């Protein structure tokens, strides 16, 4: 049940931002300590350097393809029956959706592509895998099918489902295409896109991988790819408590975990416990105008 935290600094939006009054310096991974550190300083007091450590830090030069080089190995563990959770955390504008859904290389598209390649490869070993998914949103602690919804936890299989939620088989790149196209259009920022709403809700792309080796072996693993509501400072209190609860749970898992204190953590409890693997992605802007929210985000990531 390993937990890791990565930080990703997105490229500056030239013509809109600059780093005139702040500095974010990323150090090279430290193989003697096993982590990578970064320093953040505000011009108003350059003697105060805030240091942060992460399992890996991606800078403005790291593309989505670069990011996946470090995520591919995590997601493939689902074919072995491990559950996986990947959370994109950060203020609105930091790059959560781009990271998770950018057409072709986002974490979700890359994951599906990667899993498919592994499935085809595993066929030569007598393995037969079936893939199905759901795309939901949690807004104001209520579940919404983005494609009555009650959470059903099966203590027997240690699996979870949601009643009346659309689930689609993923047996073709064509089905993946239309679904990922709809997902992006729904969450990405487009004129006729509900970004306002999207920024205030959590979206979860769920992928179930069921395999059978007619060796007689069987395998079931679930991947939960979450694009969290913006972390920037009753709907607002819902977001605050939900993110805070998630932080409490992830941190507790890394040490009574408060899974039931939020809809999100309650939904994913089986994918957060046992030998499940969790990756927390903290997205931040490199710009001086966002420096305070950036420091907030980095502080949340630390305790996590
Ligand atoms: N890694 C990145 N590389 C290039 N552009 C990015 C990257 N991350 C975000 N962006 C751009 O920054 C803006 C913030 O995008 P978005 O992903 O929607 O943020 P958030 O989901 O956190 O609110 C978008 O216009 C997006 O295209
Ligand atoms: Mg977004």
Q: Where along the chain do its domains lie?
A: 1-304
Q: Give helix then strand counts, H and E, for the chain.
A: 10, 14
For residue 139, the surrounding DSSP H or E stretch is strand 127-139
Closest Cα to residue 116, out of 71, 78, 70, 159?
A: 78
Enter the resolution in angstroms.
1.5
If you measure from the C-alpha of residue 93 to the centroid of ligand 1, how many angstroms do you get, rounded to a whole number? 6
CA atoms of 190 and 229, how far apart (whole Å): 17
Q: Which two tokens stand for residue 151?
A: 């959470």
Closest Cα to residue 287, out of 46, 58, 31, 42?
A: 42
| Expt. technique | X-ray
* DSSP letter for each residue of 1-49: --EEEEEEEPPP-BTTB--TTEEEEEPPPBTTTTBEEEEEEEGGGTT-E
Who contacts 194 (Cβ-Cβ below 8 Å, separation ≥6)? Answer: 186
**Secondary structure of 42-61 as H, E, C letters:** EHHHCCCEEEEEECEEECCC
Pocket probe for ligand 1: among 63, 64, 98, 107, the residue whose CB has the most ligand atoms within 8 Å is 98
CA atoms of 58 and 78, how far apart (whole Å): 24
24: β partners:
40
- Ligand 2 ion: nearby residues, β-carbon < 5 Å: 96-97
Q: What is the Cβ-side half-sphere exposure of residue 292, based on CA atoms within 13 angstroms?
A: 4
If you measure from the C-alpha of residue 156 to the centroid of ligand 2, how many angstroms do you get, rounded to a whole number? 36
CA atoms of 171 and 169, how far apart (whole Å): 6
Pocket probe for ligand 1: among 8, 10, 91, the residue whose CB has the most ligand atoms within 8 Å is 10
Who contacts 233 (Cβ-Cβ below 8 Å, separation ≥6)? Answer: 293, 296
CA atoms of 90 and 93, how far apart (whole Å): 8
CA atoms of 106 and 78, how far apart (whole Å): 18
If you measure from the C-alpha of residue 121 to the centroid of ligand 1, how many angstroms do you get, rounded to a whole number? 33
Closest Cα to residue 279, out of 40, 102, 72, 92?
A: 72
CA atoms of 31 and 29, how far apart (whole Å): 6
Who contacts 83 (Cβ-Cβ below 8 Å, separation ≥6)? Answer: 221, 222, 223, 224, 270, 271, 272, 274, 276, 277
Return the CATH fold of 1-304.
Kinesin (3.40.850)
Q: Is the CB of 98 under 6 A from ligand 1?
A: yes
């Amino acid at each position: 049940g390993n937990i890791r935290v990565y930080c990703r600094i997105r490229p500056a939006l030239k013509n809109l931002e600059n780093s005139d009054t702040s500095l974010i310096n990323v150090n090279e991974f430290d193989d003697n300590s096993g982590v990578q550190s970064m320093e953040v300083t505000k011009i108003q007091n350059t003697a105060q350097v805030h240091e942060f450590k992460f399992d890996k830090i991606f800078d403005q030069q790291d593309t989505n393809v670069d990011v996946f080089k470090e995520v591919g190995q995590l997601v493939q563990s689902s074919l072995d029956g491990y559950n996986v959770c990947i959370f994109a955390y950060g203020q609105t504008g930091s790059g959560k959706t781009f990271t998770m859904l950018n057409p072709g290389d986002g974490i979700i598209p890359s994951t599906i592509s990667h899993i498919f390649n592994w499935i085809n490869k595993l066929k030569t070993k007598g393995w037969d895998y079936k893939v199905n998914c759901e795309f939901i949103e949690i807004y104001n602690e209520n579940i919404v099918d983005l494609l009555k919804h009650e959470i059903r936890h099966d203590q027997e299989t240690k699996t979870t489902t949601i009643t009346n939620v659309t689930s689609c088989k993923l047996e073709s790149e064509e089905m993946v295409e239309i679904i990922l196209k709809k997902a992006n259009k729904l969450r990405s920022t487009a004129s006729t896109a509900s970004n306002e709403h999207s920024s205030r809700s959590h979206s979860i792309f769920i992928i179930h991988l069921s395999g059978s080796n007619a060796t007689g072996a069987h395998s079931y693993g679930t991947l939960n790819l979450v694009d969290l509501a913006g972390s920037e400072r009753r709907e607002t209190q819902n977001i605050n408590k939900s993110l805070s609860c998630l932080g409490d749970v992830i941190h507790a898992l890394g040490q009574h975990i408060p899974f039931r204190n939020s809809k999100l953590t309650y939904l994913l409890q089986y994918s957060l416990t046992g030998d499940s693997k969790t990756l927390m992605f903290v997205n931040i802007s490199p710009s001086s105008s966002h420096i305070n929210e950036t420091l907030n985000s980095l502080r949340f990531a630390s305790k996590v």
